[PDB]
Amino acid sequence: CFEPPPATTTQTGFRGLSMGEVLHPATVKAKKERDAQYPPALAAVKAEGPPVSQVYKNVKVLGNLTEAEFLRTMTAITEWVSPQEGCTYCHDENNLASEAKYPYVVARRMLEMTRAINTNWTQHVAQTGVTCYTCHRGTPLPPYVRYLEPTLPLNNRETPTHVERVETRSGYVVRLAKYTAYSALNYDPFTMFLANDKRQVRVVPQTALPLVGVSRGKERRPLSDAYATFALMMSISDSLGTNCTFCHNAQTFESWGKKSTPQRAIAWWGIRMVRDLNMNYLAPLNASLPASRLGRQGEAPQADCRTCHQGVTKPLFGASRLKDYPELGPIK
Amino acid sequence: MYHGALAQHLDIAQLVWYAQWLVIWTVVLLYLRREDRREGYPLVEELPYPKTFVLPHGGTVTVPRRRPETRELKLAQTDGFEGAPLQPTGNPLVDAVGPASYAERAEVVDATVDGKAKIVPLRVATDFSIAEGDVDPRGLPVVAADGVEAGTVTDLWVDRSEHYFRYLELSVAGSARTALIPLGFCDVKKDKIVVTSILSEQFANVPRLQSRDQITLREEDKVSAYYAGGLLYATPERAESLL
Amino acid sequence: ALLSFERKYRVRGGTLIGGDLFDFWVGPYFVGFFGVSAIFFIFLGVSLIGYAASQGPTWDPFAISINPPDLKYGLGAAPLLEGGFWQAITVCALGAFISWMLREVEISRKLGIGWHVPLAFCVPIFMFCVLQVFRPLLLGSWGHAFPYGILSHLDWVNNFGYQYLNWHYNPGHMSSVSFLFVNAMALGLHGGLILSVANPGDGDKVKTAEHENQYFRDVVGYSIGALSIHRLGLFLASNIFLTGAFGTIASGPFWTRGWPEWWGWWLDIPFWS
Amino acid sequence: ADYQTIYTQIQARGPHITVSGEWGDNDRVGKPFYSYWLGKIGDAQIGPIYLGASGIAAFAFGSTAILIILFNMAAEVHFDPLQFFRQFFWLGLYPPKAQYGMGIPPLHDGGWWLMAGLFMTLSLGSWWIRVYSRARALGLGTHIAWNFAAAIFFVLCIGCIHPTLVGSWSEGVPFGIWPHIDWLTAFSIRYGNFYYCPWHGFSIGFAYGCGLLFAAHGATILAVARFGGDREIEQITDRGTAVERAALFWRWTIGFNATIESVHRWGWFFSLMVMVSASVGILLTGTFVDNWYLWCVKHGAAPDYPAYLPATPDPASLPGAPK
Ligand code: BCL
Ligand code: BCL
Ligand code: BCL
Ligand SMILES: C/C=C1/c2cc3[nH]c4c(c3C)C(=O)[C@H](C(=O)OC)c4c3nc(cc4[nH]c(cc(n2)[C@@H]1C)c(C(C)=O)c4C)[C@@H](C)[C@@H]3CCC(=O)OC/C=C(\C)CCC[C@H](C)CCC[C@H](C)CCCC(C)C
Numbered sequence A: 001c002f003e004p005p006p007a008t009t010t011q012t013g014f015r016g017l018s019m020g021e022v023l024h025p026a027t028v029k030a031k032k033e034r035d036a037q038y039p040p041a042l043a044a045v046k047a048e049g050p051p052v053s054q055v056y057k058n059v060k061v062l063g064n065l066t067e068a069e070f071l072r073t074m075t076a077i078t079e080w081v082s083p084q085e086g087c088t089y090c091h092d093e094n095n096l097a098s099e100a101k102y103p104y105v106v107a108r109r110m111l112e113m114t115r116a117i118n119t120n121w122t123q124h125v126a127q128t129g130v131t132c133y134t135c136h137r138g139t140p141l142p143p144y145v146r147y148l149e150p151t152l153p154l155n156n157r158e159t160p161t162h163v164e165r166v167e168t169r170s171g172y173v174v175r176l177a178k179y180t181a182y183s184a185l186n187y188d189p190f191t192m193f194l195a196n197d198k199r200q201v202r203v204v205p206q207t208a209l210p211l212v213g214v215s216r217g218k219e220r221r222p223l224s225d226a227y228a229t230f231a232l233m234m235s236i237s238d239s240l241g242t243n244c245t246f247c248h249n250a251q252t253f254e255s256w257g258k259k260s261t262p263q264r265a266i267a268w269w270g271i272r273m274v275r276d277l278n279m280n281y282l283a284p285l286n287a288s289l290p291a292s293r294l295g296r297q298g299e300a301p302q303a304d305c306r307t308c309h310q311g312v313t314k315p316l317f318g319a320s321r322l323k324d325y326p327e328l329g330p331i332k
Numbered sequence B: 001m002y003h004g005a006l007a008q009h010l011d012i013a014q015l016v017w018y019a020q021w022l023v024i025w026t027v028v029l030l031y032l033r034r035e036d037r038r039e040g041y042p043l044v045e046e047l048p049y050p051k052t053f054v055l056p057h058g059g060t061v062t063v064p065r066r067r068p069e070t071r072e073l074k075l076a077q078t079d080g081f082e083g084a085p086l087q088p089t090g091n092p093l094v095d096a097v098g099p100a101s102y103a104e105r106a107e108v109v110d111a112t113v114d115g116k117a118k119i120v121p122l123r124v125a126t127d128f129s130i131a132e133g134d135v136d137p138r139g140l141p142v143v144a145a146d147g148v149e150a151g152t153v154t155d156l157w158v159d160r161s162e163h164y165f166r167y168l169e170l171s172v173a174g175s176a177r178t179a180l181i182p183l184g185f186c187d188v189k190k191d192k193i194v195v196t197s198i199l200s201e202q203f204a205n206v207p208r209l210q211s212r213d214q215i216t217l218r219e220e221d222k223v224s225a226y227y228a229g230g231l232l233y234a235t236p237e238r239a240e241s242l243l
Numbered sequence C: 001a002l003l004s005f006e007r008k009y010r011v012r013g014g015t016l017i018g019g020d021l022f023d024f025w026v027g028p029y030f031v032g033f034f035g036v037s038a039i040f041f042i043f044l045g046v047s048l049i050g051y052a053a054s055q056g057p058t059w060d061p062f063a064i065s066i067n068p069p070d071l072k073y074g075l076g077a078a079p080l081l082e083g084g085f086w087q088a089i090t091v092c093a094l095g096a097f098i099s100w101m102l103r104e105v106e107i108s109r110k111l112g113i114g115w116h117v118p119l120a121f122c123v124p125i126f127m128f129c130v131l132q133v134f135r136p137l138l139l140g141s142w143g144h145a146f147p148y149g150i151l152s153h154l155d156w157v158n159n160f161g162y163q164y165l166n167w168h169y170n171p172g173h174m175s176s177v178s179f180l181f182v183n184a185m186a187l188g189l190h191g192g193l194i195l196s197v198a199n200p201g202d203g204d205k206v207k208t209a210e211h212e213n214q215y216f217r218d219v220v221g222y223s224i225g226a227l228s229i230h231r232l233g234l235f236l237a238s239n240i241f242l243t244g245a246f247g248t249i250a251s252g253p254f255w256t257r258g259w260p261e262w263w264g265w266w267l268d269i270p271f272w273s
Numbered sequence D: 001a002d003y004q005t006i007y008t009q010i011q012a013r014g015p016h017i018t019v020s021g022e023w024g025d026n027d028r029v030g031k032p033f034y035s036y037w038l039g040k041i042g043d044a045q046i047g048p049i050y051l052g053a054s055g056i057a058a059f060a061f062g063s064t065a066i067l068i069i070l071f072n073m074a075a076e077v078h079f080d081p082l083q084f085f086r087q088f089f090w091l092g093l094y095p096p097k098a099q100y101g102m103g104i105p106p107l108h109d110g111g112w113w114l115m116a117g118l119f120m121t122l123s124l125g126s127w128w129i130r131v132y133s134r135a136r137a138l139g140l141g142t143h144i145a146w147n148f149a150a151a152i153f154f155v156l157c158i159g160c161i162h163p164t165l166v167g168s169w170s171e172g173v174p175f176g177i178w179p180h181i182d183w184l185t186a187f188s189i190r191y192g193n194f195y196y197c198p199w200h201g202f203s204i205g206f207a208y209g210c211g212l213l214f215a216a217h218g219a220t221i222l223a224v225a226r227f228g229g230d231r232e233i234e235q236i237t238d239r240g241t242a243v244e245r246a247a248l249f250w251r252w253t254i255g256f257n258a259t260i261e262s263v264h265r266w267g268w269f270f271s272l273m274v275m276v277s278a279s280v281g282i283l284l285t286g287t288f289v290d291n292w293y294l295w296c297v298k299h300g301a302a303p304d305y306p307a308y309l310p311a312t313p314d315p316a317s318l319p320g321a322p323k
């Protein structure tokens, strides 16, 4: 029911505004240990030789590497994605140029997606970046994925209870609640805000008086938009393991400048990145993944904030493998 | 265009802000603060026009009161300073000064809604009784502040309008009289009524009633005030500093 | 200068400390040892606010703010303009609060009444201590306290509540809020009742204590009583901060998540999960 | 110490009193019974209670609203008795989520909400007749009735008046423990932080002010209960030393005082102003003010603070930023 003292507290705003983080050491310790499982970088290899675009038969993304450099990435990918199944999770053992297994054709699109994040979304991932492990955590199914409807538990490696199963209709409210930090907000902020770019997260006016033509009757947005924004902000806050004073001065949520922290702007690029990953890379994968991977509406698993963060403001507390695998980005 | 915008840089929510302050201070200073002045005014040593109540049992009253008689205070000033304290010239409990002071209430019996005497002993209110489980104080000794038995409880006086005991009546030991005491000045135990406001000998000068089975509004004031004056005057130490 | 019924009460005595030394009146105000110490801390406090405010960027009453130190200074001393001024004014505020309360005890004793009012005044002084001393001590820094400013301290209350996602779900908050509502409701009921009996309208007779209990037995089936509504009203009012003190001191020292999630002790019981 | 201020040491019993009203004496129902433990901190007699047409209409209209709410809640858990008892704090009846303006919304999206609120409005109005007529029947002033009306008015402000003034049933308060709580944050976010509504501060000062007043007044009457201060009606018409010492306590502390009558006018006025201030604030909200914080910024009242972490430009404003 209660968590013992002492607590870790930081300051994110001017003194006397009560802005900053409030952390529990025992929680942070468990996440630091869990995130320390990141396999260290593989050792450097010979830089001279032909490019695998010559050596091999069906290399389409990593063609400029040498053979030694290319088999290195093939080992790190296995360590990050399918370490227990080994090479044959994606490869016909008797012909490594065959695309006969569905994880092969998905892995190539993931190789392109990973380079895309590190090259086109540095406004967010910066120089830390992401590798296969950032999401997969050593399993082919990433632990924290979303479907077009709320699902429990949040960690798909955990066995669900009966009421937690998406088929049991009497537990819908709890499936909605736990994805919005236990609130009673009646909105699914993933499909609404993170699956695509259709809706507007901002709901507060930037004028002191009601502007004529958007302030009466059906000119108005419904107040349901304010709840939904609040729902996305409870899900954002929980998936990063933080509170809003990490980003807003609650004096004026809608105001930037001195009223917002530099992390709020990074968060803004994080929303534009999730939509790009969901719309252009992850959702079209339902034509390549087997029916046992799809959701009840034929959707492939998709990503939110928690896919990479898993309860920390920075994925893996900032651990990086960018300099060790340049073939993952940024791409010249 | 904006809803609520007016001339200049003015808006409607701005105007109501001035109106709200004007109404609040108008009610506070011009009404509530004048209703506060219906008693104790005018000062001695802005007022509202009189208010008249029609009493439930005949007659009227108009506040504040102008009594046909006023009492002579047995008090001596301690210094000529305008805000200097006064000092008793005799026995403050019987002279009724300071915490022993009573007000000049009407010498009438407080009445029930149907006209009967409101505060009466149980010997008159034979339809009343003490609730089952509570101590019946009749027949228990009254122990005063000095630890001496001041007397013995003879009856309880009940408020027939509210069903609430308000006094105990006790025979004063060695004085051939009975005095009333407000139950607030009584610590009711199973075998004794403890009273720390006054000493045993000071029970002899409790103000006496004109009638044995009724009490007036001023007699109730006189009886209550005598024990309260003992909080400060029962012993010389109670008027001094605690530390 | 004096009320028409005041002179017979203007006697000496009832003091806690000082004796006759400070036992006098200044106009209508009684003084006593604690009236002197009250003016001491108020003058000292108002001075410190004045000198600090002159150092600031504004004399606008809504914009002036005197804030505590940064979190990094902890519970130690802080530079005068970087949190020190706040430290001294806080000490002066407590001195004026406690002196005002003990002064009320002395006035109570001279009047021969109970000490109910100064005892009740300890409730808001205690809650002030929970915000500015007790919770900062548990959290480790004075910078966790609220600033002294008309509009700035609202921003403290705002960010504090949002630091825990949705402060409304704080269970100590729900109790403090429930008492705030019922007390303001009961004061309108009770104040309206007494005025309805004494002002029946037109030229009708003033009603009785029997009419009081009959009204509320008719409306709701129960009437608590004339004296009992005053014990109740003081109980309801006091429990605004008494129960609220729990939710404030638990936020941080005993709970670092959002308050909605605290309710998982119920929602996450395995036999209906 | 006055032990009577803590509890009733000796409780009295007697024949139960019945004061006749102009009408409805025959509509009082119930045999009174006496609780010993309730008698220690109040009157021991519970009941009887008056019925009447308005009190009956209140139960019928009100039970209708509550029945509509609970049924819709039971459907949210698909009529599972375990989950309903589990998730009860989270279930609710919501106003229309889509924007239909003032058109009566569908039953599955706000229609049941609007209908329960109608029956609740009829239930509140019926109860006010009871509160008002019972005072007239007993020859009492309507001081409680008009305080009650200000609370009913504020409920109408957040219930249907403001939704009508802005023209949307979506702005109304949902029914439910947590859901009606969640409305408070969405209604403050939407309109620019209610901490910057001056009527908000006015309603807060009076609400705090009722706490200060009943603490000071309640304690004052307890302190003068030794002199029958609780007998306040007769202390008004015939001043006793109880309210003389009470006025002089406050006169010697704060330099002024009230009367035993007028202190009730303060308390009745402060409670009334909690609702009057809150009503004017909701009526101005959305109709003539869209953002209370920027409204205070427009008039120069908002406080500003130095940057602690560096200022953060709006990235949507940057050149080449996505929509
Ligand atoms: C987003 C922000 C949050 C929020 C954040 C907080 C926080 C944070 C706190 C509260 C607390 C409180 N909140 Mg809030 N609260 C919210 C929503 C609400 C709502 C609502 C309708 O939604 C209500 C009714 C309330 C109401 C309440 C109060 C009942 C409660 C106690 C106030 C307090 O401690 O005062 C304190 C008052 C004092 C200390 C006054 C002391 C006075 C002294 C003794 C004398 C002063 C003399 C003066 C200087 C003299 C001048 C001289 C002149 C001559 C007069 N909150 C929202 C959701 N709320 C507190 C609490 O208890 O929470 C459990 C608390 O800590
Ligand atoms: C945890 C909860 C928060 C809190 C949350 C809020 C919120 C939210 C609101 C207020 C509001 C107010 N609060 Mg605050 N408030 C808290 C604690 C305090 C303390 C203190 C000693 O800790 C003080 C002095 C105040 C004082 C005040 C007033 C500025 C204002 C009206 C209150 C009122 O009517 O009270 C009841 C008392 C009376 C009716 C009697 C008269 C009291 C007068 C008005 C006091 C003036 C104080 C003024 C600042 C001068 C101080 C001394 C100078 C040195 C001369 N609050 C705590 C820290 N308070 C409201 C407002 O409008 O703020 C601008 C508001 O919206
Ligand atoms: C994030 C959330 C927001 C917030 C959102 C709002 C909103 C939105 C509103 C308020 C309002 C109020 N808030 Mg605020 N509030 C916050 C922070 C605070 C703080 C603080 C210390 O921080 C305080 C002291 C307060 C306190 C207050 C109140 C003084 C004020 C009036 C409401 C009230 O008393 O309702 C209590 C009284 C009632 C609800 C009346 C009920 C009367 C009826 C008759 C009862 C009927 C009972 C009957 C049995 C029902 C039967 C039902 C069946 C279904 C039939 N809030 C923050 C900033 N608050 C209001 C206001 O003043 O707005 C300008 C308002 O509309
Ligand atoms: C739960 C019970 C409660 C309750 C009860 C009771 N309330 C009482 C009593 C009882 C019983 C009294 O007997 C006593 C009194 O006689 O009343 C007339 C008193 C009084 N309640 C006051 C204010 C009050 N009560 C609040 C809270 C509750 N009260 C709750 C509701 C609030 C809120 C909510 O904000 C306020 C503002 C004063 C008017 C008065 C003390 C004067 C004083 O002590 O003077 C002595 C001190 C001074 C004159 C000023 C000292 C200035 C310092 C040194 C420098 C400034 C510091 C300051 C922190 C800066 C603040 C900035 C600001 C923006 C943050």
Ligand SMILES: CC(C)=CCC/C(C)=C/CC/C(C)=C/CC/C(C)=C/CC/C(C)=C/CC/C(C)=C/CC/C(C)=C/CC1=C(C)C(=O)c2ccccc2C1=O
Pocket (backbone or CB within 6 Å): C026, C029, C030, C031, C035, C036, C038, C039, D212, D213, D216, D217, D218, D220, D221, D243, D246, D247, D250, D251, D253, D254, D255, D256, D257, D258, D259, D260, D263, D266
């Ligand atoms: C000049 C100088 C330095 C002198 C030194 C001596 C000295 C100590 C002086 C004190 C100087 C100071 C600091 C004065 C400030 C005093 C203060 C804090 C004044 C604030 C006044 C305020 C805002 C009070 C808020 C509460 C309020 C609205 C009260 C109005 C209604 C009243 C008066 C309620 C009090 C009151 C109550 C509560 C009763 O129950 C009661 C019962 C029967 C009769 C009368 C009363 C009564 O008057």
Ligand code: HEC
Pocket (backbone or CB within 6 Å): A056, A057, A058, A059, A060, A061, A062, A063, A071, A074, A075, A077, A078, A079, A081, A082, A086, A087, A088, A089, A090, A091, A096, A097, A103, A104, A105, A106, A107, A108, A109, A111
């Ligand atoms: C999770 C994905 C994954 C894992 C694990 C994996 N493969 Fe790969 N493999 C691929 C993909 C996708 C390609 C195509 C890459 C491209 O087109 O550039 C590929 C290409 C290759 C090729 C190029 C052959 C050709 O002619 O196209 C070789 C050789 C290879 N992998 C070897 C390995 C080795 C060695 C391992 C483990 C030790 C391994 N693979 C495990 C997905 C995987």
Ligand code: HEC
Pocket (backbone or CB within 6 Å): A200, A201, A202, A203, A204, A205, A229, A230, A233, A234, A236, A237, A240, A242, A243, A244, A246, A247, A248, A253, A254, A255, A263, A264, A265, A267, A268, A271, C162, C165, C166, D189, D316
């Ligand atoms: C890690 C980042 C982050 C966290 C945590 C966060 N916010 Fe946000 N919030 C944002 C960003 C970025 C936006 C702007 C969205 C956009 O531009 O599309 C925003 C928008 C908002 C808005 C609407 C702004 C407008 O103009 O309408 C509100 C209100 C809000 N947040 C409140 C909250 C609340 C409440 C919480 C937690 C309880 C919270 N925020 C936590 C980053 C965050």
Ligand code: HEC
Pocket (backbone or CB within 6 Å): A117, A124, A125, A126, A127, A128, A129, A130, A236, A240, A263, A264, A266, A267, A268, A270, A271, A273, A274, A303, A304, A305, A306, A307, A308, A309, A313, A314, A315, A318
């Ligand atoms: C696919 C990858 C990915 C996703 C999805 C993602 N993050 Fe990030 N995010 C990162 C990485 C990597 C960093 C580390 C950047 C750094 O070290 O500064 C980061 C950093 C941040 C930071 C900066 C924290 C700090 O201390 O500076 C914030 C805030 C943030 N993310 C919020 C979000 C938001 C908001 C979302 C989604 C709406 C999100 N994250 C989802 C990869 C991701």
Ligand SMILES: CC(C)=CCC/C(C)=C/C=C\C(C)=C\C=C\C(C)=C\C=C/C=C(C)/C=C/C=C(\C)CC/C=C(\C)CCCC(C)C
Pocket (backbone or CB within 6 Å): D066, D069, D070, D114, D116, D117, D118, D120, D121, D155, D156, D158, D159, D160, D172, D173, D174, D175, D176, D177, D180
């Ligand atoms: C068992 C006992 C004794 C009691 C049971 C109580 C109970 C369990 C109830 C069930 C669930 C609970 C606790 C629900 C709580 C709901 C709460 C807190 C609601 C709070 C606020 C809701 C409000 C203010 C709703 C207001 C709505 C209105 C005023 C609507 C007004 C409508 C109109 C004017 C209609 C006119 C328009 C016409 C054209 C249709």
Ligand SMILES: [Fe+2]
Pocket (backbone or CB within 6 Å): C190, C194, D221, D232, D264
């Ligand atoms: Fe009263």
